[PDB]
Design a protein around this ligand. Sequence first.
Ligand code: HEM
Ligand SMILES: *[C@@H]1O[C@H](CO)[C@@H](O)[C@H](O)[C@H]1NC(C)=O
Ligand SMILES: COc1cccc(OC)c1O
Ligand SMILES: COc1cccc(OC)c1O
Length: 438
Amino acid sequence: ILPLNNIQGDILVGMKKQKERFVFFQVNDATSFKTALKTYVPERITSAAILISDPSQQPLAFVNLGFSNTGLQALGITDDLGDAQFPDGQFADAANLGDDLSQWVAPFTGTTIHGVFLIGSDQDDFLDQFTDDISSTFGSSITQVQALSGSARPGDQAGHEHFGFLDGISQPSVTGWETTVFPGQAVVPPGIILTGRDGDTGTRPSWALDGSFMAFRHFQQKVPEFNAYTLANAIPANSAGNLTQQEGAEFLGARMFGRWKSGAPIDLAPTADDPALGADPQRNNNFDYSDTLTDETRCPFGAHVRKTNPRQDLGGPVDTFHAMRSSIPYGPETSDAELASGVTAQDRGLLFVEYQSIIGNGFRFQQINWANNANFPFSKPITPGIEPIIGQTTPRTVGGLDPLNQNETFTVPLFVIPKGGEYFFLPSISALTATIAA
Ligand code: HEM
Ligand SMILES: *[C@@H]1O[C@H](CO)[C@@H](O)[C@H](O)[C@H]1NC(C)=O
Ligand SMILES: COc1cccc(OC)c1O
Ligand SMILES: COc1cccc(OC)c1O
């Protein structure tokens, strides 16, 4: 049984708050930081247990805390955590991910960042109150080098990311606790997500039990450009009949993602949106590509969700490459004038968060081995190509987007720009005080 009171809640349950702030910091004084941390943790650090408690018993803000390798070093915590990528940091790994390094910005361009406080709350003012509480408690023991703040989109776009698609539908379920499991949801041993638990194969210090590694990515999105691209390349028809340009553009977007904007998976709804299905957690994940392993009519081989979770393209259930996501959009809505121009005029995007016990098996495997690999999934009659949303290999050519002309290739401009990121370790709540602050 997992000790839910000891696991940082964003890892297992997800904050699911309307607003979130990532406060990136450096440690200035290890001794002063450690005593501040011992004060802070029992008061503010939110467990999985709290996140599944009655909302009345919940605090106004949830706080979680992760450390980079240099943060652990600054604190004299020098035990090897057993991950191949964590020690060097993400900037050193960015070229491997396919990133254009010229688009990276401070303070991510190095290993200056020692950690991140994640604050989830209902309003920006509450984020400010909890940020000020960090300032008051830690004082000059830290320097806040950057804060990145996000917000759920308004109205019926709540839960949707900036291109318009419902995000946060498909997550693995870990064994070791009692929770609801939906049809089609992968059930994995807890060590796929939690370091030191069954299923983890990395060599972990005992104090690393029930922690997890976060891959953080700051993505800027080019929404008018995406919209204009789908209009310019609108699919003329599908199996059900001819499409108006607007229908064909919406369909092309769905083909790129593998889901309609509503969340309806195209493997179940291959020709038209089914918003009732999109909003149905009991059915919106109940598919595995077994009905489309050797053709692309129902779903392209290279659609976002199929690349990042290949399901039956792997030949059966595989524990190893599942990961939890707790991303949040940021920035203003895209104006009518922006969409008309087809050109981005404001900074908006995704503060992307993915948790796994082995960075190389979760985020990094999904990115490099799968999304960036034109020849993945394997053994297909048409080359899948590069995942159109986040695949980084050039040329960004993907096949099969038009179900009636599957050999047609699309060369897709990059609409998602990495601006920085880092690899963090989130310890257990007890480890925060018993180890990190010792
Ligand atoms: C701005 C960039 C991105 C956007 C807009 C985006 C959007 C989405 C959307 C709309 C979904 C479908 C709903 C869901 O299952 O949650 C999804 C699923 C998913 N995405 Fe992304 N994503 C982005 C980047 C990434 C990256 C960089 C990765 C990992 C390398 C990733 C991994 C996944 C995974 C694992 C799923 C669930 C797949 C499944 O289990 O079927 N995404 N994403
Ligand atoms: C469908 O679209 C084609 C052009 O792509 C057109 O020739 C045809 O008349 C349309 N309608 C039907 C019912 O086939
Ligand atoms: C329906 O869900 C699945 C089926 C088969 C394999 C999966 O992950 C590799 C998976 O997530
Ligand atoms: C019928 O399915 C196929 C036919 C020809 C080649 C294939 O992959 C190499 C394939 O999967």
